[PDB]
Structure formats: structure tokens, C-alpha cells
């Protein structure tokens with residue numbers, strides 16, 4: 001069984017967290033290494049209709065980093081396809097250790113600013129696709 005799963009997500013606005021830590025260069029490096037792209041310095045938050053638990057899937061945990069004296073926690077990362085209209089963009093879900101949002105909100109990263117390049121406004125619904133599971 002090659003298992004897929006397509007989920008809908010309502011574009012929502014957040015605390016502006018992702019733009020920050022995605023700027024720092026060991027994250028850039030690890031994401032470049034893990035995902036094969038350098039993500040736009042931000043996360044697109046999406047509200048889902050039900051709790052999302054990254055542990056149900058085969059994620060990648062990044063290591064904690066020490067960056068010029070200050071330390072930083074790693075994140076779990078799960079590559080996905082972002083389905084916006086006819087297109088399929090490569091991206092990933094990122095789950096950081098601590099989060100102000102509910103467990104129905106996920107953060108998406110991608111090569112480009114998706115709002116801009118797909119004229120996304122809050123409330124728009126997009127789909128993300130997840131290949132395999134924890135047992136594949």
C-alpha cells in the first residue's frame with residue numbers, strides 16, 4: 001500500500017514567528033539539505049478541521065543548534081505537496097517545540113512566498129498532500 005492523505009487548510013494569520021527562525025543560517029542549511037530548497041523566510045499558517053499530530057507520520061527532527069552562544073530548538077519537518085489550483089508545490093509542514101497556536105493550526109514552508117505568488121488571502125482554502133505514514 002502506497003498511502004496518501006489530502007487535507008484542506010484555511011489560510012490564517014499568526015504571530016509572525018516563522019519569518020524569524022527561518023532567517024537563521026543553520027536552519028537555512030538543514031532545510032536546504034532536508035528538502036532540497038531554501039525556504040522563503042516565513043511560514044504560511046493553515047487552520048485544519050481537526051487536530052494534526054506530526055508523530056503519526058515519518059517526520060524529520062532537526063537537531064537543536066547552538067548559534068553564537070544562544071541555543072535553538074529543532075523542529076519536526078514533514079515534506080508535503082501544496083496543491084493550489086492546478087499546481088503542486090513542494091513544501092513541508094514544520095512543527096516547533098513551543099507554539100502559541102492550537103493543534104489544528106499547521107505551519108507550511110515553501111521555496112516562495114505563497115500568498116504573493118498565488119494571490120492568497122486569509123480564509124482561502126488550499127490543500128496539502130502527505131505521502132506515506134509512520135510505517136513506510
Ligand SMILES: Nc1ccn([C@@H]2O[C@H](COP(=O)(O)OP(=O)(O)O)[C@@H](O)[C@H]2O)c(=O)n1
Pocket residue numbers: 012013014015016017018019020040041042043044045108109110111112113114115116
Ligand atoms: N511560504 C510562505 C511563507 C510565508 N508566507 C507569508 O509570509 C508572511 C511571513 O510569514 P510569517 O512567519 O510571518 O507568518 P505569520 O506568522 O505572519 O502568518 C506571513 O504572512 C505568511 O503568511 C507566505 O505567503 N508563504
Ligand code: NA
Pocket residue numbers: 014015016017018019042043044045107
Ligand atoms: Na507563521
